[PDB]
Amino acid sequence: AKEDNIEMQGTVLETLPNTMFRVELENGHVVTAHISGKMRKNYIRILTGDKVTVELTPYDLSKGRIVFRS
């Protein structure tokens, strides 16, 4: 019953405090992203230069949730 989330790919440019990250997407836009609850429960570390999948929402195109680290 929820609205759909578009998933994009991107690179981690910068680690910010408390599981927050600047991520450049393929389109060229930088977004501030936070780790998903699955990834933090299962201890999947994210670092600078990592490639990630970012769930975005149409309500705010400056924010995202990192849902996978390749």
């Binding site: 680690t15 570390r45 670092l47 600078t48 230069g49 990592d50």
Partner: protein
């Protein structure tokens, strides 16, 4: 007798020592600038500088990130120091650059 005197006059030359500074791949600007002032001091006093850079875990995947720090240090101390052992590969979980005065 004595000559100890003459030794003291010979001693007021110099002995070179090696001062180790250790960076990391992610080290912020302020904290970089502190460690640079340590190196400037050592080199202006005529001492060698063993600049290390360590990696942990999966920081080794992004080796290129670490390399640029050592390149940044080198280019900031270009006028003061000469390079003596610019690294090639990660030996262990470390890379070691050695600088020297002038």
């Amino acid at each position: 007798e004595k000559s100890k005197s003459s030794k003291e006059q010979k001693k007021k030359q110099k002995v070179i020592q090696v001062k180790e500074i250790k960076f990391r791949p992610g080290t912020d600007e302020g904290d970089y600038q502190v460690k640079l002032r340590s190196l400037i001091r050592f080199l202006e006093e005529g001492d060698k500088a063993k600049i290390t850079l360590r990696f942990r875990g999966r920081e080794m995947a992004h080796q290129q990130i670490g390399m640029e720090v050592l390149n940044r240090v080198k280019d900031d101390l270009q006028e003061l120091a000469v390079v003596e052992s610019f690294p090639t590969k990660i030996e262990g979980r470390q890379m070691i650059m050695v600088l020297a005065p002038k």
